[PDB]
Design a protein around this nucleic acid. Structure first.
Ligand SMILES: [Mg+2]
Ligand SMILES: [Mg+2]
Ligand SMILES: [Mg+2]
Ligand SMILES: [Mg+2]
Ligand SMILES: [Mg+2]
Ligand SMILES: [Mg+2]
Ligand SMILES: [Mg+2]
Lengths: 58, 141, 262, 185, 131
RNA sequence: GGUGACCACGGGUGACGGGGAAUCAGGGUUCGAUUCCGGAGAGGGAGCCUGAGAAACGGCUACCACAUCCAAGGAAGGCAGCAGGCGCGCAAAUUACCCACUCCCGACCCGGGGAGGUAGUGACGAAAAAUAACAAUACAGGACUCUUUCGAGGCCCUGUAAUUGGAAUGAGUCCACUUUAAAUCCUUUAACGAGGAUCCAUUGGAGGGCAAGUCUGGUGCCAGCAGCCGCGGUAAUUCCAGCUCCAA
């Protein structure tokens, strides 16, 4: 073997450790379906944008 | 053309089963040579003992070292190469451990740019490699 | 197996016993007796699932031991005695008398009968033969055999038999235009009149029977059992009169019965 | 050996293709409109309709005046008008093929209690039913998917034990009441 | 006690066991499943009998309270009650005692009497030392 | 003489047969060790006693292979029964309670039954179904309405943050009842039990197939991802993370 295995786990070692921010508990079940049904169906947006996607990075 | 007589059923079925040997899937699953040549012997998984840690070169359009382990199956004592499918799970692997190796994905065929490797490691030292990767549980130190 | 079987799985029990799937794994497994186990009712089911007198197996054990159950004029202590067809189940302590006759759907039904109509019983002669010293014998559909019968009785006829004596009170000849009852197969439990008896040498005879409503059906000779002289039945027929009705008309019969009772 | 039953069957069928924008929105319309927990129960009612459509279609190919077509024809028509998705006068095998899933969904107890006005919302209805508050006839029912029949439709009402029919208020009302009397003479 | 009523149905008499059989449904509107003793004494008053021969069992409470359905057994005499009744119900009412040992020891005693032949002194003395 | 290209004979089977299971236009293709019926076997063969019924093995005799005790002279074995161990493995449960039910056996209403029933382990799998509902404030939105954009409310639905803000509930503790052979569980029904109602839903993805980011920070043909196309050699929509979305 070439013995190039010394670099295993390189990038994951280098990556800075940023902790997850605490967030409100996400509604689950029928309520989660309620939220997404209300979000995408019963709403009118006057702003244009040619129907941009749910994860718009504008 | 094909025969269409009322009492040609014997010819139709005999011709069918003779021609069924000409596609790889039927030949493979009914000849038995593939079953004998399979290191796993028709099993979904297999335990084995890590014989060494080796690195495999990628194909031409790629350029990387794939960290695999040479493993001897506890049954039948066959030596196979099993890929380690994570970023730093080779360090989680040491010498002479039980590893649950599984098929890589497409039925004894090489996957991706890894040449000649058809198996990947699932568990080591009877603890899952995913659990070790995600930190759910640590090595039995 | 290496010998006789003495178990009967619940699933493998005859359908007309009308047993469920959850109480247990086994079935009464009736003892040997005058009737075959496929077309017999063990006393255990008759006093537990028919009349609901007993709740469990040991409860019907106590009632049989106390000796009020009297089949065909004799007290029977066997919990799994094979009752059979048109046998008189007399329970004198309660004063009720039952004649075991198939209903319209080929199932044995509770047929309460009068005490004086329980003193006799019909029977189908199966084999006729002469014994030693030239004595003619006669075996019926039951395992009951009698000697010295009237020389006019042939095979597959019906003999009027009275209980407590075993003699032949009278007999019914097998002939065209006689009322009968089917005792086996799809047409089991259908009351009708013989119309035609076609015969096949070396094989089973086929008879054609027409009921009161005019429906014509056929069956094998071994499933015939003449219970009437021409038109008049000699026994009190059960509710439904042994008439077969298709899926169309019991449904509207429920609706009419429900509507009247509603 | 054992006296079990092991007679079970799945009540739903997953879609053949995943990730259609058209199918995902259509099911999400129904789930939000009728207040359903997940897509399994919209698949369940869809499977129920498909079984009915399959049975009705088989009878239609069957020759007319066939006893089976006649007997089973009114058999399935009888129960379709009993639950209420089919009109009383719409008693034809053809009209069954025209049925949808909305009618099979509005016969649900969660939908009927909302429509009866007992519940302020379809989603209030599910939590109200689940909280052992509503009753049909003299029986309390805590299942939202309880399909109601035309006869049982009128009887739907609050349970006597609930803090909406008879007395016996909830614990939070009692704890609030006991705290109020404990805070003063 | 204020609102507890007893109803009977499927009533039928069978002098086969000198008893009358019925299935009873209780109506405890806001109360737990009423104890069998109270049903026994009320069912006795409905049928004018002493509340020591009445037998009741199989009480299942319906969903949401209220109705509970049970099976009712009555007899013309306590003598007959001791005669033809399952022993658990007699033990439930205290008229039969099952002050015995566990089945595992009984099997061991039987096997240990199988090892010793004939001699009554040792056949009855097989279970003394290995207590 | 008999059988054979209408496939005899021989060989293989990872072959116990069938009822049936999976898939489901129609036709079919696989699967049936496995609860019902039939067969076979009891470590491998072989031979027998008794009996109506056995070539029986929770019967005997012998040999072979294992294996137990011994004072070494002998003696005793058969869990492919229920449990429970070892081994084999990718792979499979408690050395529990009871004859209460279903039936079986017996001289028999009375005895016995690891048959069988009950409980324990059990994310094989299947059915139902929690993780929230509502109201009033703020700010948008609506075919909104009132003067004909401007402002308000005689209306409706979402959303973000709030001393809101007091109503409903189970999951949990726990009384009794009930269930039961005795229990347990379930159903009943007391007293507690929800504002991060922190009583905290996860598993996989976000280039395409295929729903979802041309966000931010690292790494720099390395680590790695990637079922297939492909991404990464310093501005990565694809790796490692955060955030945010997507599917169940
Ligand atoms: Mg085999
Ligand atoms: Mg099989
Ligand atoms: Mg054998
Ligand atoms: Mg004998
Ligand atoms: Mg043998
Ligand atoms: Mg939770
Ligand atoms: Mg990412």
């Amino acid at each position: 073997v070439h013995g190039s295995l010394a670099r295993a786990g390189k990038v994951r070692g280098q990556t800075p450790k940023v902790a997850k921010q605490e967030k409100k508990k996400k509604k689950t079940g029928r309520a989660k379906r309620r939220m997404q049904y209300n979000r995408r169906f019963v709403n009118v947006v006057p702003t244009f944008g040619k129907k941009k996607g749910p994860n718009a990075n504008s | 053309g094909k025969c269409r007589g009322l009492r040609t059923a014997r010819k139709l079925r005999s011709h069918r089963r003779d021609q069924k040997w000409h596609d790889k899937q039927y030949k493979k699953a009914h000849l038995g040579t593939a079953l004998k040549a399979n290191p796993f012997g028709g099993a979904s998984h297999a335990k084995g003992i890590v014989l060494e840690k080796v690195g495999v070169e990628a194909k031409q359009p790629n350029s990387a070292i794939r960290k695999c382990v040479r493993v001897q199956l506890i049954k039948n004592g066959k030596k196979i190469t099993a890929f380690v499918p994570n970023d730093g799970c080779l360090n989680f692997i040491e010498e002479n451990d039980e590893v649950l190796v599984a098929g890589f994905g497409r039925k004894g065929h090489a996957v991706g740019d890894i040449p000649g490797v058809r198996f990947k490691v699932v568990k080591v030292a009877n603890v899952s490699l995913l659990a070790l990767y995600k930190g759910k549980k640590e090595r039995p130190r | 197996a290496r010998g006789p079987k003495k178990h009967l799985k619940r699933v493998a029990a005859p359908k007309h016993w009308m047993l469920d799937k959850l109480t247990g794994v086994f079935a009464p497994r009736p003892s040997t007796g005058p009737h075959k186990l496929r077309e017999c009712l063990p006393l255990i089911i008759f006093l537990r699932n028919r009349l609901k007198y007993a709740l469990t197996g040991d409860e019907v054990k106590k009632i049989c031991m106390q000796r009020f159950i009297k089949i065909d004029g004799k007290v029977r202590t066997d919990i799994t005695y094979p009752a059979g067809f048109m046998d008189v189940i007399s329970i004198d302590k309660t004063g009720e008398n039952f004649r075991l006759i198939y209903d319209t759907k080929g199932r044995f039904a509770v047929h309460r009968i009068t005490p004086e109509e329980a003193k006799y019983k019909l029977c189908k002669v199966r084999k006729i033969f002469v014994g030693t010293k030239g004595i003619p014998h006669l075996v019926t559909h039951d395992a009951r055999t009698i000697r010295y019968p009237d020389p006019l009785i042939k095979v597959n006829d019906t003999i009027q038999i009275d209980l407590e004596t075993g003699k032949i009170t009278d007999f019914i000849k097998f002939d065209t235009g006689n009322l009968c009852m089917v005792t086996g197969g799809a047409n089991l439990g259908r009351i009708g009149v013989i119309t035609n008896r076609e015969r096949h040498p070396g094989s089973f005879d086929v008879v054609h029977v027409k009921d009161a409503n005019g429906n014509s059906f056929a069956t094998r000779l071994s499933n015939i059992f003449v219970i009437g002289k021409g038109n008049k039945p000699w026994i009190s027929l059960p509710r439904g009169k042994g008439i077969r009705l298709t899926i169309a008309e019991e449904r509207d019969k429920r609706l009419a019965a429900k509507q009247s009772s509603g | 050996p054992v006296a079990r039953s092991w007679v079970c069957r799945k009540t739903y069928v997953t879609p053949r293709r995943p990730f259609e924008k058209s199918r995902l929105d259509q099911e999400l319309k129904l789930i939000g409109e009728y207040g359903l927990r997940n897509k399994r129960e919209v698949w369940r009612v869809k499977f129920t309709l498909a079984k009915i459509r399959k049975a009705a279609r088989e009878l239609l190919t069957l020759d007319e005046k066939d006893p089976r077509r006649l007997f089973e024809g009114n058999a399935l028509l009888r129960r379709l008008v009993r639950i209420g998705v089919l009109d009383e006068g719409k008693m034809k095998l053809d009209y069954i093929l025209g049925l949808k899933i909305e009618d099979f969904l509005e016969r649900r107890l969660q939908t009927q209690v909302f429509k009866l006005g007992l519940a302020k919302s379809i989603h209030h209805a599910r939590v109200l039913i689940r909280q052992r508050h509503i009753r049909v006839r003299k029986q309390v029912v805590n299942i939202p998917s309880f399909i109601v029949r035309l006869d049982s439709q009128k009887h739907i009402d609050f349970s006597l034990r609930s803090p909406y029919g008879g007395g016996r208020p909830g614990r939070v009302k009692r704890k609030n009441a006991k705290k109020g009397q404990g805070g003063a003479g | 006690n204020d609102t507890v009523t007893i109803r009977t149905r499927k009533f039928m008499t069978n002098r086969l066991l000198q008893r009358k059989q019925m299935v009873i449904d209780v109506l405890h509107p806001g109360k737990a499943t009423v104890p069998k003793t109270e049903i026994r004494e009320k069912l006795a008053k409905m049928y004018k009998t002493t509340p020591d021969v009445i037998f009741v069992f199989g009480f299942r409470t319906h969903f949401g309270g209220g109705k509970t359905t049970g099976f009712g057994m009555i007899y013309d005499s306590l003598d007959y009650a001791k005669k033809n009744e399952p022993k658990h119900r007699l033990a439930r009412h205290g008229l039969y005692e099952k002050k015995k040992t566990s089945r595992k020891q009984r099997k061991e005693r039987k096997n240990r009497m199988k090892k010793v032949r004939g001699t009554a002194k040792a056949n009855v003395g097989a279970g003394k030392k290995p207590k």
